[PDB]
């Protein structure tokens, strides 16, 4: 069931803002990693004393990369005066999120109709707030809300080229690297409390329940009034015989934050070839893959859907695939981003649904669980 | 002249530390952009809970990249149980350290026969202790103290691969990239008075005077019997009608530091070929090229040295050229390495001084601010 309870007018996932200690090296890691182009910045270059912040783009997928400068090049200012292009950047939350928790997710940006009503709505369904709409030159909105540890939730709202006071990169530096990746899918957060987690973000958004599961962990999705917004999340479940990896999270990142974001392929088999050739020489490496039992059991499940010889390829690239009453879908998962066992990317496809593709179509995985640890067990046979 | 005073026995630049928020991004953005190899590593998987490290080697040159884990995983561990693998790593140096400069070198690491004596002598004779002779496994002995701003000289001496308590890397995630680059040449740092700074650390080495000069800064050369570690340093020079670029690197570093580490290359041209490749995807960006007429003013500064393609190659990849009465210099430099606009590095090779060759041989390139100035002159002309 579907009650699309938003309430507020919710458009798409707009962009993902890492706070960085160096966002230079940051970016140009993901860059080529993920075949991402430098395609806007904000900088001492383009008159930011604050912080430098680099925008990696991939079709409709949005990466910002932030970090402060010295506090001393900005001393005089005041932020009524600032030369900041993000007015929520502060120079100490910025050091005491990553000194705390390392490379990581700040801020989860939604597109919204309205951010000043977003915010006020937000809040008064029980949202915290953390920084109040500001008006940029005019043009866009900005305000964020509590989302879970040290993330926010930001909503931007546009009268009508990501923010004033970013500059179009020069194309020389903006190299139109692309490896196949389109849009943000799902961005998923591990919290201590599921309950109190749900209740709160459910409370202030109106967002729905897409789905719920159970490993060592529970989970639900919270979705918006389409289903393209979809923000899972997990909490540890204790007692296991083998410790939870949602624990191991909390441990490593100091508390609750953003555990993975699934980013989607217009063709995943692209995809994982170009970030394979990547992994050793500055890209991202891949989670061990599935023992050739996987593959086997896989003709037996989604035969119908997948060519023998498309199995094969998702065999060579070590993609996993999981099956709905509704749609199919490949996934596979990155090793950690940086030097926390914390933070990993999820690459996905979705296949069916189609009405337009309809948002979540084929879950989120949780078949692989049972699917994975059984040909494990064959394998070793 | 060279009196050969070194108050202890030192052979060469062993490695370079850089003090990272995260480690891992750092290194694998060199090893692209440097072609320089994952050879080394000491982290959670081996067993370190105190910080993550990753080695790069290209030749004989090593890079150590280090970032603190969070302090929650080592809380119940002292100084005598320590799982660190670098003795004199503590956790908030490294968060004061990037908190105030941002990415850039902490240690500046040479080879020596005894590291405890050689931590003794420079003692007595003023060095200010950082941290004590520490022997690791009964194998190696690791010593520090203050250079200048909070970048320490870190002694190393071996008993008979990097350190104690570092493994190998795995040969998948050990691409075997190079580039050419072979060996550190110098290692250049930027302060506010020059006297002072050398006065102190040739008084603790006995290191003697190279060369000197003088552009917006005074510099000196001081360097071991041998002439093969040399360590550059610059002063600002206040009252030019152009700002001095050493007094914006110590605004913008909060204090001394380092400013920029020259890397030999055996084959300047293959080296800058490849740089040059990679510099928009994910690699290192050089500052803009000499006008044409700085190549066309080469034929007659080195024509007897370099022939007409050479300096066409040259002219290609933005290469400079200076001259000594007794070698010539190739020397090119890239845009700052991180965020801010501190380090950098050159890439060098050297022609002449044949006996093996004599460190140093051409200089530092004093000659070529003069060279590209009337360069820049005759162009717009
Ligand atoms: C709840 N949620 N909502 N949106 N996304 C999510 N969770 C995930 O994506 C997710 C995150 C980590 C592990 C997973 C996930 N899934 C769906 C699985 O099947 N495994 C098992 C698995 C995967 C790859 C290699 C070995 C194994 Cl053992
Ligand atoms: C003192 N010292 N000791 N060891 N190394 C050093 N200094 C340097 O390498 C050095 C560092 C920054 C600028 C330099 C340097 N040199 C030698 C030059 O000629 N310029 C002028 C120059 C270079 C490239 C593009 C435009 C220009 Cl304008
Ligand atoms: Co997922
Ligand atoms: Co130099």
Partial sequence: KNPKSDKFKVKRFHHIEFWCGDATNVARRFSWGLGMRFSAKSDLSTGNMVHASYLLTSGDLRFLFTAPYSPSLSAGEIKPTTTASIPSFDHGSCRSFFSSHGLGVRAVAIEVEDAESAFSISVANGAIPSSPPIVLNEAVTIAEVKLYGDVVLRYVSYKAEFLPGFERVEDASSFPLDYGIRRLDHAVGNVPELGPALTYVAGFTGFHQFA???????????????????????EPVHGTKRKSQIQTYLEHNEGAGLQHLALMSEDIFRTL??????????GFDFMPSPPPTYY???????????????????????????????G??????????????????????????????????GGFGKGNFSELFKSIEEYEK
């Fill in 212 to 234: 719920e599961f159970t490993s060592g962990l529970n989970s639900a999705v919270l979705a918006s009034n389409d289903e393209m917004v979809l923000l899972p999340i997990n």
């Fill in 273 to 282: 070839r170009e970030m394979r050739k990547r992994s050793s020489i500055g």
């Fill in 296 to 326: 086997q059991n896989l003709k037996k499940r989604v035969g119908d859907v997948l060519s023998d010889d498309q199995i094969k390829e998702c065999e060579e690239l070590g993609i996993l695939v999981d099956r709905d009453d509704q």
């Fill in 328 to 361: 199919t879908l490949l996934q596979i998962f990155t090793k950690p981003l940086g030097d926390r066992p914390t933070i990993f990317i999820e690459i996905i496809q979705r296949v069916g649904c189609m009405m337009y593709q309809s948002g979540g179509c």
